[PDB]
Amino acid sequence: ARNPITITPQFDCGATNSQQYVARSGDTLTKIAQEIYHDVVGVCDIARANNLADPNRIDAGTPYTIPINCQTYDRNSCL
Amino acid sequence: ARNPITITPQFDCGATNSQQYVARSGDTLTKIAQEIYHDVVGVCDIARANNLADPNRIDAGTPYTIPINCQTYDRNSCL
Ligand SMILES: CC(=O)N[C@@H]1[C@@H](O)[C@H](O[C@@H]2O[C@H](CO)[C@@H](O[C@@H]3O[C@H](CO)[C@@H](O)[C@H](O)[C@H]3NC(C)=O)[C@H](O)[C@H]2NC(C)=O)[C@@H](CO)O[C@H]1O
Ligand SMILES: [Cl-]
Ligand SMILES: [Cl-]
């Protein structure tokens, strides 16, 4: 019923918008994606958005780009 | 650098995906949008998605549709 629109993604997951999230001690990608962001992004979307090799290595005090409006969600391909 | 894609929004905010969130006692649209969903949706996007008459009035135990990948965010037009 709504008209289709064309968007230009900034991430492979199709997201156009993002936030900067600074990891806290004890944060993991699963906690960030699933709890802090209430599962609106996949753990592996975050990893690819940040060009991360190992998704289990997250550094306290480092900002991570969180794509917040993905069209698709990759929860485990990088796992 | 990525190629544009065409999507069909299911909500006025441009979102294609959503979740159901069941309001807890004490919940408000503000705390749902800003804390639970970490600002990835606007208070007024939630109100419009659920055809809420009063954005200040939500019912404990009632499920609400949360558009999770809006293109635009409406934080206050309905307030
Ligand atoms: C847009 C926004 O965030 N507005 C905030 C107000 O919603 C909030 O007021 C409180 O709102 C809640 C949710 O509507 C009210 O709780 C509901 O109360 C009714 C009647 O008592 C009850 O039937 C519902 O079960 C119950 N729902 C929930 C989820 O608890 C509550 O009464 C409102 N409180 C006051 C004082 O008006 C106010 C205050 O925090 O802030 C706005 O920003
Ligand atoms: Cl990406
Ligand atoms: Cl809507």
Residue numbers in the entry:
A (entry chain A), B (entry chain B): 1 to 79
Please quote the authors directly.
The LysM effectors Mg1LysM and Mg3LysM, with one and three LysM domains, respectively, have been characterized from the Septoria tritici blotch pathogen of wheat, Z. tritici. Intriguingly, however, Mg1LysM was characterized as a functional homolog of Avr4 that protects hyphae against hydrolysis by host chitinases. The crystal structure of Mg1LysM from the Septoria blotch pathogen of wheat, Zymoseptoria tritici, revealed that chitin-induced dimerization of two Mg1LysM protomers through high affinity binding is required for hyphal protection against chitinases. Since Mg1LysM also forms ligand-independent homodimers, a supramolecular structure can be formed in which chitin-induced oligomerization of Mg1LysM ligand-independent homodimers form a contiguous Mg1LysM higher ordered structure that is anchored to the chitin in the fungal cell wall to prevent hydrolysis by host chitinases.
To this end, Mg1LysM was heterologously produced in the yeast Pichia pastoris and purified based on the presence of a His-FLAG affinity tag. A native dataset was finally refined to a resolution of 2.41 Å with an Rwork and Rfree of 17.96% and 22.03%, respectively. The four Mg1LysM monomers within the a.u. form two pairs of homodimers that are each very tightly packed. In addition, the crystal structure revealed that the N-terminal 12 amino acid tails of the homodimer run anti-parallel and form a small but stable β-sheet (5ITI7 of each chain) that is stabilized by clustering of all four isoleucine side-chain residues and by threonine-threonine sidechain hydrogen bonding, potentially strengthening the homodimer. The latter hypothesis is further supported by the formation of two additional salt bridges formed between Arg2 of one subunit and Asp12 of the other one.
